[PDB]
């Protein structure tokens, strides 16, 4: 989204880095290695504004980056939002994401 | 490991690659047809080591035991460990054993028989007397002491065999 | 090998597949928990070889030595190599050793003691005289020559042990 | 195994990944620098087994033989298997051998010489007579029976060597 | 302030990270543990523009973050500005702050 | 420039930090140590927007930082654009720059 | 000590912090796994003191006693305190004790046996006569005075043991 | 450690926690009622060590010395170290000491007295003569040599005491 | 323990207090400069115990051994255990040793030398003869028997040393 | 030292120049590949000193010892220090050693063997008798005294070696 | 070298860099704590050379001399050069020196005493008579020729020492 | 190292500083007038080592050899290694050599002559006969055996020289 929440296991304020890319492995329309650039297209560093509560990171991004699709939690410090060929990647250092969702006021 | 094919246009490509990498990686720790630096494993085929081999635990080879009275009360107990036979002379001379005679009560079985004639040196309890028993390749042992009709024969050692 | 997860929608899929393939492939030449056809390696677990094993270099087993005067001036030097004890009888009879008596200065330590009684045949320098010393499982060695008060006992051989 | 690089924007990505997984997987069954639980393989380097090793087939070590008439008609036949020398005393006393004399017709070669003196116990055919031959580090053997000018010396056993 | 100066012991350009938070330990109005969130409220990562001279960092922040209260130097790589319950935290990486003050143009 | 391209040797997305400064070692008008501040003047952290392709970093900076000079490649992970006394410095961590040029659309 | 977690947004913070500080502080005077400068405490593990240790009270070590008639009426009383055996020779020579003979009525138990032969010097009441009794590692003590058939043997001292 | 109370609504709350944390932390390095791995410390109470204790420096126990003429010119010098008394026989026989007589010039102090009778073996300078002096529980030493009126008594050793 | 400062306005107050309490609490079970009721620990500084100390395991002190022929064929074997030297007289008189003479082959090293002259009582095998050897602080041992040219000297005991 | 590049337009020029000067300067006092006038250092390569070298402390060279009975009870103890072998002749003639005969119990190992034949002069205790033992390059030592069957051979000296 | 700091905004930048460059460069030719390929230098610390060292000039070691009359007119002159003592026997037998007797006029000082007994072989002028003098570790030299009362003793050689 | 000047207002300032730092730094690894911890290097000047020096490889000193027949068929072979001369007496007495006579066929050259008279002890093959040859500072050797006209003189050792 614009404002996305990441729940985590740290008692601190882990750094979060957001990336945007198209056609990553298994997101291609016509299956594996069917896209124009194997492995994914241009990776864009998403500018973020970070805010912290106990075990919660509030990630603010420009509106153009809003993408609600499938919220996929990867067993390490990574959450993905996948909408067909498009991916919004959230990478957390020094902690593990336990839950992720668009900020509901 | 059993792996699935990876091809252009396939569905669940990432999951297939991951599962294939994990299947292969598992065999690098245990199982499969690979010999590991840990765990109990059975290995087949002629393994030739061209360097030095060190064994800190036990080294077990094929073992077989036999015991019998050769003749005249003399008992021979054998244990084959690889190409070596461990012997122990025992019993008590209970009848007349002629000098240079064949001990005809029991022969040494073929699996314990040497390629060449073996002279097993022994001693008689209570004095300075020695003797020897020859085990030829036939296993029909021969007594090479003098004519004897009493005493306690003893002696522990080894002799070579082959396979 | 240490490999990273491969999943749908990961950035750096091509690079993670490459780096996982490389980490796995490295362990096919050296390192990890796999035994290789090159290099010095440490291997744990019960390795059972069902075929023929050939060693062209050395084969080193666990070794331990001990030497002591059993009694009467008789010295026994032992070297344990696996399940075999190599012995060497030495010294000089310095006091009266009665026929069939126990040698009570020093007992053979437990780690060098046989399962069953072992008869070590020896010879006295300068004549035709033979004796034997029994090593029972207790380690209290017994002299089976006649009553003797002098001489040079000698004899090199082996006797079996287990573990 | 021989694997090709996988990278972002490559042509024939799926084919390369598949052929890399297959090349690696092949080495988990046979070939490469990996030791397998099947097939005849040659292995190099110091392999240290910290556990129990069992061999069900044959265990072949480096072997070397030597035979020679030490002196006085006494023949000594040796076979070195690793750090053990299997001996067999043979021949017939054909001349006068003084007590405690050196047997000077042939010396035991250096590769069969022990660290310390080894006393090889033997028996003379026909009676209760024993003797011993010492093998010192020099290999110049020494007779420790009394002066003898005839007889048939016999005895089979082992003595240790090192490397 | 908007433009703040941190004097330091490094001969280099130490990274500075600024945070904004309310009700931290000992800043609560009605004494210790009297606030709504024990330990402090939401921590906001302050966007900064960094500029360097010899042993001087010029920290430019948005004007909303201007808070001149009491300048507290902590015997390590941290300087605080405290105005009642509100704290502006300066964390230096790989150097110690020796003095901190608002920039006078 | 405003949009600059750094080619590199990494198979990944290396972090790029940009700095601007005047009168560095050997950029002084009247030769070595002829300027007002010896090591160089104030070091300004240039804000960046980074996007990546294989072995290519697209560096987007404010237009005010545009500079066309001599493009100097340093043996390590660094690239400079020098025009007289003025330098724009590209520092890549965990990779080496192999080529640098202004982005042509 | 058993302490409760302190965390952001905590339910009853000050109470928790205070009670955690008190639980920890209590262990700085008595209890817990800490050794204190007061009270009776049981301590486990290899404590190595690299400096000087002074003991103003008593130093109690495990002790074991044994007493037995070695032979010929000679009594040996022992007390093992650590690696030292305190001995006391007592009794009265009640039968003929041959010079250099073994005292065969009772052997010194293994736990009281030295690594090497210990010569316990004694004196015979009423004259200038000394003797010694050897305790070999087997525990079969030996009389090293001349042939004696009477007298009162005495002597108090120590000999070393090990573990 | 001396710590201040921590309560909700407190003034200088953080500074109090910090002082309290530091007071406690100080006692984990030196001072207080805790035994440390550094510095000179005095420890009270029954300290029971259930494991092995090693001392690399000195082990000082309670010591007391005494020396006196027992009688007939015989001097006994003692040093009590824990439960052991180190003795040294000295002097010169200056008058007639009857066989089996009590040495009545001075008694051994009660603190150096054994529970049971101790026989201290000695030698006379210049010949083969040995004697012994018994120390009974009373401290009135007894001479167990024959009647003597001259000579140099010597002997160093130990005897046990208790507390 | 290594703890972080707790102060007014700090960002992670509750987390720092928690981590500081846990770091301190950890040192109440293991590690740090505190002596615990469990585990192997090395302790430095003069530890004075004013009460009763009990050791249920072993008490190991600094040990050093030496053996040398003092002269005339007399061997002295020493083992220093703290402030006590355990001695054993051995060898065989191989030359004329004059009465009251210094034994000039080898001196007892300084670390084994007593503060005051010690008299080590011994006995000669096969008769009633006793002697003594004095160890002065110089280590030049002195024979206090009569002039002797043969015999087997024996004797086990202790003498005190200091540091 | 590890120094960074100094170049036109560099950020941190003054600071890189300073840190480079300090890194180089540090190696002028300790560390690096430079030999200093202080501290313990390991130096490799052929160092040829064309002037005079003085050593005020110790000069330690590669050392190796060996000791063995050459034959007839004659013991030769060797210590190789660089290109010199320090020898000490010991033992006792225990059997007939013929004039000009080889000593056939043990040869001098190759590492202690001279390039050319060395004549080691010795003396026999108790009279004016001298002998010499030759060490040829083979290590089979030769006795150059007359036929001897008793006596104490002695002699300390050196002979040269090379490598 | 002593170098000044180079820093941002510094006054006399180029002059400081140049002067620093020169101060450092001077130490690469002479002075400082660096060892150079020219000039007389004093070097401290354990210098370990792992390669070959060649010295074309002189190699001076710590030297110490001593000369004295051992007894009976025999003079021993010694020079210690490192771990070797160069000796020269001189003098004239001026009194009766008994076979196997101690030379009691002067002992060899401790710094010249060997670890073990050294046998210094010498010759008497005018005939075929040899002797030896033993230097034990005590320095009390012993004469091992027969009883002698006249003659000129000579002999030059070396014996080893250690530190 | 060769460095360029750095000055205010120069062109190519950064490249000059860089080249100067690199030139200096190069001399801290190899070359220049500095002694390194690697490589073969030639060092001049009096190097005084105040600490301990250890050499693991070879220590080569200036060597010179000489051999010649002194007279009467007596050959002396010498090798000077620093301040020590290694000698070997060889040859065969082929003419009458008078007692205390000068050996006038060849003189020991000046470079091999000692500061003081050296007595080289030798032995005559086949018996107990010893002699000595003196090397005075002139090199005109002297025979100090009796008048001799036959025999094989032998003896290896060393004598000192100086510079
Ligand atoms: Br794309
Ligand atoms: Br017989
Ligand atoms: Br031998
Ligand atoms: Br036969
Ligand atoms: Br709040
Ligand atoms: Br400027
Ligand atoms: Br023993
Ligand atoms: Br007596
Ligand atoms: Br002596
Ligand atoms: Br010695």
UniProtKB/TrEMBL annotation, chains A, E, F:
Boundaries of the shown chain within the full protein: 195 to 299 of 299
Identification of the protein by name: ORF48
Highest taxon of source: Viruses
Species of provenance: Lactococcus phage TP901-1
TrEMBL record, chains B, C, D, G, H, I, J, K, L:
Lower baseplate protein N-terminal domain mapped to chain residues: 34-52
Protein origin, superkingdom: Viruses
CDD domains reported in the protein's UniProt record: RBP-H (cd07964)
Residue intervals passing through the bilayer: none
SUPFAM superfamilies, A to Z: Phage fibre proteins, Virus attachment protein globular domain
Any GO BP: cell adhesion
Residue ranges occupied by any Receptor-binding protein of phage tail base-plate Siphoviridae head domain in the UniProt entry: 65-160
Coiled coil start-end: none
InterPro entries: Adenovirus_pIV-like_att (IPR008982), BppL_N (IPR040956), Caudo_bapla_RBP (IPR015027)
Key word Electron transport present: no
Gene Ontology cellular-component terms listed: virus tail, baseplate
Gene3D superfamilies attached to this UniProt entry: 6.10.140.2190, Phage tail base-plate Siphoviridae RBP, head domain (2.60.40.1830)
Keywords recorded for this protein, A-Z: Host-virus interaction, Viral attachment to host cell, Virion, Virus entry into host cell
Compartments where located: Virion
Name assigned to this protein: BPP
Gene name of the record: bpp
